[PDB]
Amino acid sequence: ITGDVSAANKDAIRKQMDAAASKGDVETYRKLKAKLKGIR
């Protein structure tokens, strides 16, 4: 089912963020984080 509302989406984004976050490429992490902080 394509019902991956923020519940699922958030999770996915989280992984990508965590990786690029504490991995050196914090650039993408920061950006993503911001958006996630506004995800209505």
Curated annotation (Swiss-Prot):
Upregulation: The scaffolding protein negatively regulates its own synthesis when it is not assembled into proheads.
Highest taxon listed in the record's lineage: Viruses
Segments crossing the lipid bilayer: none
Spans annotated as Interaction with the capsid protein: 12-40
Oligomeric form and interacting partners: Homodimer. Homotetramer. Interacts with the portal protein; this interaction initiates procapsid assembly, thereby ensuring incorporation of only one portal ring per capsid. Interacts (via C-terminus) with the capsid protein; this interaction allow to form the procapsid, in which the scaffolding protein forms an internal shell in the icosahedrally arranged capsid protein subunits.
Function: Required for procapsid assembly. The interior of the prohead is filled with the scaffolding protein. The scaffolding protein is lost from the structure during packaging. Scaffolding protein exit is followed by the expansion of the procapsid into a mature capsid.
Protein name, entry field: Scaffolding protein
Gene name linked to the record: 8
Section covered of the full-length record: 264 to 303 of 303
